Amino acid sequence: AMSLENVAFNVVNKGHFDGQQGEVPVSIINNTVYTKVDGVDVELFENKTTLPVNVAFELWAKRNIKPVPEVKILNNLGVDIAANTVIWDYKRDAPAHISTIGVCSMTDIAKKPTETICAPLTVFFDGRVDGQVDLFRNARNGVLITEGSVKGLQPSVGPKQASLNGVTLIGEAVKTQFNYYKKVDGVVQQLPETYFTQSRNLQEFKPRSQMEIDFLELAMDEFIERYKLEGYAFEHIVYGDFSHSQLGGLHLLIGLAKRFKESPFELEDFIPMDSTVKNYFITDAQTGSSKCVCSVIDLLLDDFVEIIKSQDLSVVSKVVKVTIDYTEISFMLWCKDGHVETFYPKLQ
Amino acid sequence: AMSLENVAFNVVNKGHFDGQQGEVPVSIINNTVYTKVDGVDVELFENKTTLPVNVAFELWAKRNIKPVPEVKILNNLGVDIAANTVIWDYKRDAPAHISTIGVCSMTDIAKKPTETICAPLTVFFDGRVDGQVDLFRNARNGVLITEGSVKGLQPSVGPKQASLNGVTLIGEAVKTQFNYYKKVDGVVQQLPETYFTQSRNLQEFKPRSQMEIDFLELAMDEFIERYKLEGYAFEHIVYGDFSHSQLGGLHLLIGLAKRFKESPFELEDFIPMDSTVKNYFITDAQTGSSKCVCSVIDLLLDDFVEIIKSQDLSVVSKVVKVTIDYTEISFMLWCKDGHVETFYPKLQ
Amino acid sequence: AMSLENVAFNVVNKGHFDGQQGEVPVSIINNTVYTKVDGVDVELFENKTTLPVNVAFELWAKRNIKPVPEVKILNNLGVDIAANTVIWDYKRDAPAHISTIGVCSMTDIAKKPTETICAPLTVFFDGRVDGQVDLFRNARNGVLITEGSVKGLQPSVGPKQASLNGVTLIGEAVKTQFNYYKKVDGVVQQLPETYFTQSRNLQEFKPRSQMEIDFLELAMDEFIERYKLEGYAFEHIVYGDFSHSQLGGLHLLIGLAKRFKESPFELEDFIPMDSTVKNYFITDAQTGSSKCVCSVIDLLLDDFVEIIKSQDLSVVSKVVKVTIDYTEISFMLWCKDGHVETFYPKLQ
Amino acid sequence: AMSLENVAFNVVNKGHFDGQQGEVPVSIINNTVYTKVDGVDVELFENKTTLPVNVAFELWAKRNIKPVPEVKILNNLGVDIAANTVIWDYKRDAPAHISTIGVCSMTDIAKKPTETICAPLTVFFDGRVDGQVDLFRNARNGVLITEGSVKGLQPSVGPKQASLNGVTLIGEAVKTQFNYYKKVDGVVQQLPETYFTQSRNLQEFKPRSQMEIDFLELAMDEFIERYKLEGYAFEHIVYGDFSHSQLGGLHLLIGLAKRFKESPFELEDFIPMDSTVKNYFITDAQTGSSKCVCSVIDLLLDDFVEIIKSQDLSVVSKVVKVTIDYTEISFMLWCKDGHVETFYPKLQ
Amino acid sequence: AMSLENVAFNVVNKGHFDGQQGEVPVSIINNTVYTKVDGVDVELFENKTTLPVNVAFELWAKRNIKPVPEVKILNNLGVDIAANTVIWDYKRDAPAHISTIGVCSMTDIAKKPTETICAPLTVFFDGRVDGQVDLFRNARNGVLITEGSVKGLQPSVGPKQASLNGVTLIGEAVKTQFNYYKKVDGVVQQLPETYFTQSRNLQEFKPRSQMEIDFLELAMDEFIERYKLEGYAFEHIVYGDFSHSQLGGLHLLIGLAKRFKESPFELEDFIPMDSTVKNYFITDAQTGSSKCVCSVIDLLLDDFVEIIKSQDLSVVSKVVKVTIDYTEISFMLWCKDGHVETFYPKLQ
Numbered sequence A, B, C, D, E: 001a002m003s004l005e006n007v008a009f010n011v012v013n014k015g016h017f018d019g020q021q022g023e024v025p026v027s028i029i030n031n032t033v034y035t036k037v038d039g040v041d042v043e044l045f046e047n048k049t050t051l052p053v054n055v056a057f058e059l060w061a062k063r064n065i066k067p068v069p070e071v072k073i074l075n076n077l078g079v080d081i082a083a084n085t086v087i088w089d090y091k092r093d094a095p096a097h098i099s100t101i102g103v104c105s106m107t108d109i110a111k112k113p114t115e116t117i118c119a120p121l122t123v124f125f126d127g128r129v130d131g132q133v134d135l136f137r138n139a140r141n142g143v144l145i146t147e148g149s150v151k152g153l154q155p156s157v158g159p160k161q162a163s164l165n166g167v168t169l170i171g172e173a174v175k176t177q178f179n180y181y182k183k184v185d186g187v188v189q190q191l192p193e194t195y196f197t198q199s200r201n202l203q204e205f206k207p208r209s210q211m212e213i214d215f216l217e218l219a220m221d222e223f224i225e226r227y228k229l230e231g232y233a234f235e236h237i238v239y240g241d242f243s244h245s246q247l248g249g250l251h252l253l254i255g256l257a258k259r260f261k262e263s264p265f266e267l268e269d270f271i272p273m274d275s276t277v278k279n280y281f282i283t284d285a286q287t288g289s290s291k292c293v294c295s296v297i298d299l300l301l302d303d304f305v306e307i308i309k310s311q312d313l314s315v316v317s318k319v320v321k322v323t324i325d326y327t328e329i330s331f332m333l334w335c336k337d338g339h340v341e342t343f344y345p346k347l348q
């Protein structure tokens, strides 16, 4: 017994859609949903999606309010659709997937993922919901997340962090570390050995190791000195060269976090989505140095050190593929006389 | 248990709102309501009101599908609101009135007209609906329409025609002639002795008397000759002078209907509504004669003849008030040497 | 090398998309596409779809400009998508189908119909285009139209009429009669023995038989007298009873065409689309008789006569299914004492 | 003392802007202007321009309500701007020109055409307004229209017809024939000896000569027989060949008017504007013959006869330039053995 | 070979328009540009201008990504248009100028500034681009910026700061100090002796002299004591009187910066543009003192001290013109008994 008036009632009284019965009066003026809160109109939802205002209002209200895998993780694992839930893409103010299953009649391609329409698309299954583990076992294609062990299935320990209502966090009061399982054409998969991006902010960056505390506390030539990083171009790649017209290096988030405490800079996110490697148009406000496409990746500093140290420095330029967030991230490794000139994530 | 999905279901399955239960999936794109009719979107309603698309969609679907008094008649009788119905302005694609009573939660000022909010408003009562005659008796202000007699209430036989879903007709299968009753401050006000406009189109004009058949068939100087209309300026007022830069006279619809069979002309309705006197920006396409404000009124030709003949032709210019459609329409009667120079509905 | 500027160039110089190279300057204001035609903006396309203005502009410009099966025929044959073409719904100003194949990158689900995404969808194949007959043979699901014979494939002679740029016509300079072929699950399905709706207008109705000329020329009780239609309720079903508040019968377009010459009436098409049975909210402007859902079907008069005469008139009410336009149209046949009380296309 | 409320007051009380003082309350909902006409909103103007709703509302209200040269004539004479008036494009619901002079502050580039900004623009001068003849004499570039003689200035008798509020007419009550004068770089340019298009409609076409009455009344092979048009392909060019898939010829409006009485056809005006040669996407509804770009020009039949007969028929294909409406319209004259194969307005 | 799909491709892959070939699929939904980044739509640009979404998307992507003079500087120097570049007005989310030269076909008035259309408008020339110095020499009117010396031309050292992608900075990695050259009607100009506004933020204000460090560090009556500012009303003008209903003085940004560390206040920028003197509706959140138009100018404290000290204090009120940012800023100097009562930038 779904309706715009019942969906808005749930937003008004339960904070989101809770299946409760009741209706509040709604008015729609363009791409914005309002409700008469005694006399005057109070805005419940502003549509920022490509979907019709009422269809997207419902999807937003029927979003998952539990910690779910980050959109980048789901996209890297070829997830197409979610089973009986809406993964809200909080960085895009839109539903993460094209269609739904058993959620909104207007976006729904199926009511249950058992239907032939779902057979070819990798349906996401939340093992924390009743019966979704068995739905994954019978599903032709899928991605399952579980909190604990699944009999028979070989687990793949995912990232420590998950998204709770847009907030990317490492849960303490809730579990955010999941077991990943992927299936392709009925065959259970052996997920790759992978690294995970730390998914941190520039404003609230916090070091997650002793190397990260030493990088943020110690001066440039003494962090490298302590960690034997001579000839790995950390001064260029991680610290960033702000001396010339084009901003040099600055590809690890920890370097942007360190440059931030001292001086600010503009990061223009021209493709605002969730990806393992993010591209920014940076302008360092102090020096005036700038770059149009500056690929910034947030790896744990020890992980980037372990990646660059596990490399061959003989050729001038080669493509270094690294499995990060279940995806093959290509990097361009530039060299000269046994040392790194630059090592940035490849612009593909 | 009202909702956009239940209103749209009723539009799809009953042609309008019929109180039936059920829901169809709806999408709102700007000011237009669509429903997925197997695979693709079919438009159910295009919003042309100043109300939000969904609020107006509901009002339109909950419109009166029975013959109701023409909007001009309701406007002349100082009607402000309708009791438990929506009177639709098919001339402007919008509800004839600002607020509702027991229809739409978003426009509703009351559920029943007995409430104190309705006391100073002239609520329209349809005596054809159960209990609306008594609601008129207790209502402080109102306008009642009945098919037959109401005990004690002095009747006022209204126009032969009524609006059935936009179609202004003289009913045969239904009753379009009503009894009018008005009350102001709790006192039943006596309705004036009035004329009624024939509410006809220019494309489908049809004469409604022998004088009207003689006017549309005979030549100019022989219609006047037969009906002794010498000295009343019917050549200017009713026939229309298309000889100078400014179009002369042409104020009776029957004259526009006669000029239409021979030659076309552009009538720019710059204030699109239903009024007893309509103002048009006319451009006669044959001669090129034109007028910016040309007040055109559709009275029965015999009625205009009976109005002008009964007028005193001694003074040069006087204001002639005539009760038409329950409103006092002022006219400017111009004269010279015992004859009418011009007689037009006065520009206030 | 597709672009909004190349699509608009083709609209400006070729009348539609013709694959020609070149670009005209375009501006987009809301849901409307304009081109600067020396100094000022001339409107090339007004978006009436639920697709983005530029995505729909391209689909409209890349429409099929050859006679194609009417949208109702394609909808009755379960057609979901078109192979490398856009079938335009001129009745709703929008593409007849949700997605495209090898036409627009933004709507495209595939470049060629051979792809696994097209396997469960009924792809429409135009046998008049090179290689589309073989594509139908290999396609898991499809609907093929051919001008002549296809070896092995059992033909189904479709309607005489087809849609040429919105114009439903019976071609003389072009072939509008096609051979239909349908396949489901990789199996060529036998098309039913069917009737075809004449797809005519109310304004320009033209009789297509001697019975139709006799119906439009003769009086009521002498058309029935000549065609021995005693006891079949043609006075109610085909002629229409305009005597009571609710309009009786009037379910054959030929009856609406005959009532039209004498008097006008309002037909509110509340679900604007192309269907075998159309539902209208009729208001006869002369009598005032009206119906909310009046199912009107345009069969050839001889076909409706042949359908009703062959029916058994013993039971009071039975569901009469008739195959019209490849769909099983249900009808409710009401009877009493060996004669038809009413026989209308059943309201599901 | 200009304002949206004063402009709307003038629209409401004078039919257009008349410089009168006063203000009515206005509301703007999207691209539409409304005024509260007692209780409810009545629409005064729907914006169809690329200008802001209020800026265009004012331009429309301050339009020229006198007969002015047709937009095509002004466009052919290189007119860029109007002096202290707004020439309205009733064919596109927008001001014919980009900027204004002494009309709207928001579009105004100058208050008077004497200003240096107007010097390289061809300002249109209406000699019927006080002082505009002298403004033309001092204006570096301009186009002047006068009713009578201007001393020293060599006249160019323009078309018999002019546009009066969208209505293209040959004035009787007003003068529609003007004297044209053009100046370029401060030098009075001699206007060419030209033909004029008759500017007629397909619905209300009326012959304007004995040849045109004979063409619309007589059969094909006897109109040509009477007017000695053997060997000029009037059967193809003017009559139109509806026998093959592509519609042949049909380039004179009189041929479309003659084909119209018998059978209808769809003319898709894909570039909606006023031009000497119009391009249409025609689909003959009877035969099914069609053309994507069918250049249709409305010349007087005698004028087209006089153009084609005077042409040399020796070469296979040559470009025939003809001065029509002050513009050199190119035509492609195709020939074989002393006769015309085709003669159409050339597709540039 | 320009197009919406090529412009968006460049935004997606190069961070801005870089002339690279390629096309990404785009959808336009109202005033917002999106691109399908695998499955779902990612927003590339939200239109905040008065230009059509696609025309303004292109201008934004084709913006100058090098340090250019601040919009206020260009407006003060009468710059009308830019030569073969787009100066983005980052404070207005729009292109700084009406038209373009050799950038966007839809805004372009010329391809090269040598054209007669550019002769009367002051074209901005960037001497850092090849051949723009010579274009300035031949240009009738222009404003040239060079990094170094131009033979013959007398330089005018502009501000230390320039705008790099919205970021107003004093370049270290790039040059931001330019040489200004202006030309009027072919005559090279002697630019005025001028002051420059420091163009600083309230959040990140940084002192740029010893007087500014003493003002931000020292208490009120000891800064004045040290700098002999007795009788110059710095307590009112620069410090600000927050004791009465109307906020007194507070006209120098350094005073707003000092009041900010202690307590916050609301600055309503009701005309959000870049001007030498900015007008704000201030409300001091601590005291409740407020002003509707509070003219705030960011001069270096030593410059304001040198301006007020270089004044005559005899008359009660006079207009003090000061050349700041190449424009004549008027100030109202109020006095009594040989001292300043107030000295604020004049409200013109």
Ligand SMILES: NCCNC(=O)Nc1ccccc1
Pocket (backbone or CB within 6 Å): B049, B050, B051, B089, B091, B092, B093, B094, B095, B096, B097, B098, B099, B272, B273, B274, D040, D041, D042
């Ligand atoms: N002829 C005037 C018709 N227009 C309206 O009736 N507009 C309206 C309706 C409801 C609320 C506000 C305005």
Ligand SMILES: NCCNC(=O)Nc1ccccc1
Pocket (backbone or CB within 6 Å): B040, B041, B042, C049, C050, C051, C089, C091, C092, C093, C094, C095, C096, C097, C098, C099, C272, C273, C274
């Ligand atoms: N009679 C229905 C026609 N309407 C449509 O066909 N709408 C549409 C087209 C493409 C994508 C989504 C909706």
Ligand SMILES: NCCNC(=O)Nc1ccccc1
Pocket (backbone or CB within 6 Å): C040, C041, C042, D049, D050, D051, D089, D091, D092, D093, D094, D095, D096, D097, D098, D099, D272, D273, D274
């Ligand atoms: N047939 C073209 C008519 N369209 C316009 O004239 N558009 C317009 C008007 C004023 C400013 C910008 C565009």
